[PDB]
Design an enzyme around this catalytic site. Structure first.
Site, PDB file in Angstrom:
ATOM      1  N   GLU A 149       0.847  -1.220   0.000  1.00  0.00           N
ATOM      2  CA  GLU A 149       0.000   0.000   0.000  1.00  0.00           C
ATOM      3  C   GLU A 149       0.869   1.251   0.000  1.00  0.00           C
ATOM      4  O   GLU A 149       0.696   2.117   0.826  1.00  0.00           O
ATOM      5  CB  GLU A 149      -0.987  -0.057   1.177  1.00  0.00           C
ATOM      6  CG  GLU A 149      -1.956  -1.227   1.017  1.00  0.00           C
ATOM      7  CD  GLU A 149      -2.927  -1.373   2.183  1.00  0.00           C
ATOM      8  OE1 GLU A 149      -2.767  -0.681   3.232  1.00  0.00           O
ATOM      9  OE2 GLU A 149      -3.826  -2.216   2.075  1.00  0.00           O
ATOM     10  N   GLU A 271      -4.413  -9.080  -0.085  1.00  0.00           N
ATOM     11  CA  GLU A 271      -5.166  -9.010   1.181  1.00  0.00           C
ATOM     12  C   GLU A 271      -6.653  -8.821   0.887  1.00  0.00           C
ATOM     13  O   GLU A 271      -6.982  -8.049   0.003  1.00  0.00           O
ATOM     14  CB  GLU A 271      -4.714  -7.812   1.992  1.00  0.00           C
ATOM     15  CG  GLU A 271      -3.428  -7.944   2.778  1.00  0.00           C
ATOM     16  CD  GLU A 271      -3.084  -6.668   3.515  1.00  0.00           C
ATOM     17  OE1 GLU A 271      -4.040  -5.960   3.866  1.00  0.00           O
ATOM     18  OE2 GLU A 271      -1.875  -6.396   3.676  1.00  0.00           O
TER      19      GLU A 271
END
Ligand SMILES: OC[C@H]1O[C@@H](O)[C@H](O)[C@@H](O)[C@@H]1O
Ligand SMILES: [Mg+2]
Length: 339
Positions: A149, A271
């Site tokens: 991220e 994820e």
């Protein structure tokens, strides 16, 4: 022809993340960082349990920042590198597919300022050189995910795929990661390397700006905890899953198909998951629609597991690590029996 990556990935049933463990940021330059957010030290038996249940792939999120020496070498503290290797080796001992990432570097030096491209790329490369050298002889079941991220924390578009200038920096950082790893040679010449979008975000503009490397042994990682108001607790969130909101998943998946799947670019959801809201039946149905959606094109996912379930915090926990029992066997069954 990226077919080798597709073949490797097809061996995964479904994956599991060792969350809030090596990615935890307490304890400073110490192996105790592992237990700093309240999880127990990882053992071969925790990992066996995950594998035995049917998650034959494991993501090992790791935050390196506080274990790095000073610039420009950014040497990973030997103790930490050895503990990371011990943990990966739990999975290797069990023949698992494995992702090693860098994780909350984003609390530290990984702040996506396009004016700092060189210092960012250089740090990323220096770290990955050392990791690639350490795991050089590991087989093709070990995959590397360069960033997690990557973004500018606090910025307005932090969680909406950033700005155009930031997306361009991410392309450069993805390239730096790939370059540093390929240059170490050995099994790293063709190891699957998992790049990402800004924030691992999957909105159309973010996919549209993603540069696809010519390297044929890459995959693109995204995080799709979709829809947000079902999987997270927030103003507007709900705990009921009747299918009416399946289109949020589909629409989002249609863009992944357009920019990636239908261009023959491998994609991995590194994820996803749903916080437990005393809604077992709802989560079982959501998994059917969410993972059923990825299964249409053989897309694999890795479920986030932070070992939080009865207690306070984001309740993504599935394995009760200290008892070696699953917090919720019905939710877990829907994941491992998805196919
Ligand atoms: O409660 C367990 C952990 O959850 C994380 O996402 C927070 O950053 C940590 O501070 C917290 O300790
Ligand atoms: Mg080779």
């Amino acid at each position: 022809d990226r077919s080798r990556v597709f073949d490797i990935l097809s061996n995964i049933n479904i994956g599991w993340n060792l969350g809030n463990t090596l990615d935890a940021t307490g304890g400073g330059n110490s192996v105790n960082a592992e237990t700093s957010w309240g999880n127990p030290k990882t053992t071969q038996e925790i990992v066996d349990t995950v594998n035995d249940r049917g998650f034959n792939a494991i993501r090992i999120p790791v935050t390196f920042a506080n274990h790095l020496g000073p610039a420009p070498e950014y040497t990973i503290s030997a103790d930490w590198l050895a503990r990371v290797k011990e943990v990966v080796d739990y999975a290797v001992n069990d023949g698992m597919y494995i992702i090693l990432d860098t994780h909350h570097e984003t609390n530290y030096w990984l702040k996506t300022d396009p004016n700092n491209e060189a210092a960012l790329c250089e740090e990323l490369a220096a770290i990955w050189k050392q990791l690639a050298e350490a795991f050089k002889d590991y087989d093709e079941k070990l995959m590397f995910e360069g960033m997690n991220e990557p973004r500018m924390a606090g910025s307005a578009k932090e969680w909406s795929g950033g700005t155009p200038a930031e997306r361009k920096l991410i392309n450069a950082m993805n390239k730096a990661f790939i370059d540093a790893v390929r240059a170490t040679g050995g099994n790293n010449a063709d190891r699957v390397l998992i790049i990402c979008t800004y924030g691992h975000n999957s909105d159309e503009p973010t996919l549209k700006d993603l540069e696809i490397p010519s390297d044929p042994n890459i995959a693109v990682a995204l995080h799709t905890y979709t829809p947000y108001f079902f999987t997270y607790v927030a103003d507007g969130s709900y705990s009921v899953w009747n299918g009416s909101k399946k289109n949020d998943i589909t629409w989002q998946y249609n863009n992944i198909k357009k920019y990636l799947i239908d261009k023959g670019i491998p994609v991995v959801i590194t994820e996803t998951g749903a916080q437990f809201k005393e809604n077992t039946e709802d989560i079982v149905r959501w998994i059917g629609d969410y993972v059923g959606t990825l299964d249409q094109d053989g897309v694999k996912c890795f479920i986030w597991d932070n070992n939080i379930y009865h207690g306070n915090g984001e309740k993504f926990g599935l394995l009760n690590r200290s008892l070696l029992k699953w917090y919720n066997d019905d939710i877990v069954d829907a994941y491992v029996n998805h196919a």
